[PDB]
Amino acid sequence: YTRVVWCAVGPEEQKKCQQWSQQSGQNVTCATASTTDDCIVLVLKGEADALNLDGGYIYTAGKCGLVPVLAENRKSSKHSSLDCVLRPTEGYLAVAVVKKANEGLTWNSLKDKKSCHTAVDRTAGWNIPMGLIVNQTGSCAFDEFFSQSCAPGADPKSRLCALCAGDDQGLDKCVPNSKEKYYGYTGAFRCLAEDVGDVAFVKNDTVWENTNGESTADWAKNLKREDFRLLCLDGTRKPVTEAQSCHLAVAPNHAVVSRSDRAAHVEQVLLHQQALFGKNGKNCPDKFCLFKSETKNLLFNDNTECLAKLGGRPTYEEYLGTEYVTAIANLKKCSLEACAF
Ligand SMILES: CCCCCCCCCCC[C@@H](O)CC(=O)N[C@H]1[C@@H](OP(=O)(O)O)O[C@H](CO)[C@@H](O)[C@@H]1OC(=O)C[C@H](O)CCCCCCCCCCC
Ligand SMILES: *[C@@H]1O[C@H](CO)[C@@H](O[C@@H]2O[C@H](CO)[C@@H](O[C@@H]3O[C@H](CO)[C@@H](O)[C@H](O)[C@@H]3O)[C@H](O)[C@H]2NC(C)=O)[C@H](O)[C@H]1NC(C)=O
Ligand SMILES: *[C@@H]1O[C@H](CO)[C@@H](O[C@@H]2O[C@H](CO)[C@@H](O)[C@H](O)[C@H]2NC(C)=O)[C@H](O)[C@H]1NC(C)=O
Ligand SMILES: *[C@@H]1O[C@H](CO)[C@@H](O)[C@H](O)[C@H]1NC(C)=O
Ligand SMILES: [Fe+3]
Ligand SMILES: [Zn+2]
Ligand SMILES: [Zn+2]
């Protein structure tokens, strides 16, 4: 009865999920959809139990009644006493990244430039940067700010998708799943690396994890951190080592969400699954590692140490934080208290 149906977004996550299922002895099975929004709908219908989501999607899911269950917790340095599962999350740093060689480009000269976003509706790749831009320009025409962009999830024929590349066949251009070459943290950063875009809206960790040999992938294996710069809100440019004083915002960690009535069961199963396939899991790396997918961040971000319990049994609003929730609310007024489905 404690069989948990995970929802994989796209064929690559589906593949990983199938392996997880096999190894879990069917304690976890898989449902697959083409987009995160579609997965959310599968959960709402009760045809899937849960999935890990970025804060922007948590907002969508929460408005529809879904709740936070456990949050991704990466490596920390503070509070090192507590066990990962009980350690409070620290959130991640949303940043705007450019090539150092692209001299003179600052936060204040982004207009008409080319941009790379993780996907529409995501925290670092969309909600934070576009919310800030809309705000500063006093215009809801965020589709006319950048000359061209790759913002997975937007209209494929629009300029917001002009830079997306689709899959190895050139198909699925701009789809919001790993099939799109420039999808997600890694895809958006690659979009910048290959100079397809002038700026990439990702998180701090993405830059470090795909530079100086941290990634063996063909497009990243030869990337050096010193060739990149972060754009601070005061118009200055800083080395990627100064993210703490040069970010667009602190984002709430991605987290697992499920229907309220399945929360308890999903939590129980996951806590047990990571004991087996997590960071120091009994069967990882020997049999299967839930938090690995060769930098592709499938199902979970690859830098996840463990899924941690949430203190205070927070509502989706409490988990995201009132400020972030309000920021999203305001941005969405551009394109009010009900489920978008
Ligand atoms: C522009 C950027 C500026 C920089 C800002 C810096 C902050 C960014 C961090 C992300 C924000 C988010 O984490 C805030 C948050 O979560 N707040 C708690 C709070 O909600 P608010 O809406 O913010 O009032 O109030 C709620 C109650 O009043 C409380 O529940 C909320 O949520 C939490 O605190 C959730 C937990 O912290 C989840 C993490 C695990 C911590 C506990 C350890 C586990 C042990 C539990 C054992 C059962
Ligand atoms: C874009 O600009 C809008 C408009 O200012 C921002 O929304 C505003 O956000 C602030 C801060 O979150 C809200 O202020 C208040 O917060 C305090 C708690 O500190 C609370 O006590 C007050 O009641 C109030 O909510 C302000 O209300 C809110 N304005 C509106 C109309 O909701 C938004 O944050 C900006 N977006 C980004 C990404 O910065
Ligand atoms: C930005 O993210 C990077 C990558 O996650 C962080 O670098 C890691 O820092 C941790 C300690 O916090 C070390 O355990 C790792 O060795 C680092 N990884 C790499 C590849 O360098 C960095 O600390 C983060 N910076 C900020 C400001 O949060
Ligand atoms: C599957 O879940 C059952 C239920 O308790 C548990 O006994 C078993 O150890 C689990 N097996 C795996 C490999 O997940
Ligand atoms: Fe995110
Ligand atoms: Zn800050
Ligand atoms: Zn509460």
**DSSP class per residue in 228-276:** EEEEPTTS-EEEGGGGGGS-SEEEPPPEEEE-GGGHHHHHHHHHHHHHH
Residue 19 dihedral angles phi and psi, to the nearest 5°: -70, -40
Breaks (C-N over 2.5 A) in the chain follow: 335
> Residue 250 to residues 4, 55, 94, 117: CA-CA distances in angstroms?
31, 11, 6, 17
Separation of 24 CA from ligand 5 center, angstroms? 27
- In angstroms, the CA 50 to CA 45 distance is 12
- In angstroms, the CA 314 to CA 322 distance is 12
136, 146 Cβ separation under 8 angstroms: no
- In angstroms, the CA 33 to CA 177 distance is 10
180, 172 Cβ separation under 8 angstroms: yes
229, 240 Cβ separation under 8 angstroms: yes
Side chain identity, residue 165: A
Ligand 4 atom at minimal distance to the Cα of residue 28: 14
> Residue 109 to residues 163, 236, 262: CA-CA distances in angstroms?
19, 11, 48
- In angstroms, the CA 171 to CA 322 distance is 39
312 within ligand 1 shell (Cβ under 6 A): yes
DSSP 8-state assignment for residue 111: T
- Who lines ligand 4 at CB under 6 A? 2, 24-25, 27
Side chain identity, residue 106: T
- In angstroms, the CA 158 to CA 140 distance is 16
Separation of 268 CA from ligand 7 center, angstroms? 21
58, two tokens: 């948590």
Q: What is the largest CA-CA distance in the chain?
A: 59
- In angstroms, the CA 161 to CA 179 distance is 14
Q: Rounded to the nearest 10 degrees, how much is the dihedral formed by the CA atoms of 238, 200, 124, 76?
A: -50
- In angstroms, the CA 67 to CA 225 distance is 38
DSSP conformation letters of 28-92: EEEEEESSHHHHHHHHHHTS--EEEE-HHHHHHHHHTT-EEEEEEEE--SSSTTS-GGGSPP--E
193 within ligand 3 shell (Cβ under 6 A): no
| Listed residue (20, 44, 28, 23) closest to 268, CA to CA | 28
Helices and strands counted in the chain (H then E): 9, 13
Domains of the chain (ranges plus CATH)? 2-73+255-316 (3.40.190.10), 74-254+317-327 (3.40.190.10)
- In angstroms, the CA 287 to CA 126 distance is 36
Strands ordered across the beta sheet of 28-33:
28-33, 4-9, 50-53, 255-258, 67-74, 304-309
Buried b (16+ CB within 10 A) or exposed e, 201-219: bbbbbbbbbbbeeebeeee
The bridge status of strand 255-258 relative to strand 67-74 is antiparallel
The bridge status of strand 148-150 relative to strand 114-117 is parallel
311-320 contacts at long range (C-beta below 8 A, 24 or more positions apart):
311/88, 314/68, 315/62, 315/67, 316/58, 316/59, 316/61, 316/62, 316/63, 316/66, 316/67, 316/68, 316/257, 317/62, 319/58, 319/68, 319/71, 319/252, 319/255, 320/55, 320/58, 320/59, 320/62, 320/252
199, 214 Cβ separation under 8 angstroms: no
Separation of 123 CA from ligand 5 center, angstroms? 5
| Listed residue (260, 253, 288) closest to 27, CA to CA | 288
181, 147 Cβ separation under 8 angstroms: no
Percentage helix, strand, coil, to 5, in the chain?
A: 35, 20, 50
The answer to whether the Cα torsion of 206, 208, 210, 216 is positive or negative is negative
226 within ligand 2 shell (Cβ under 6 A): no
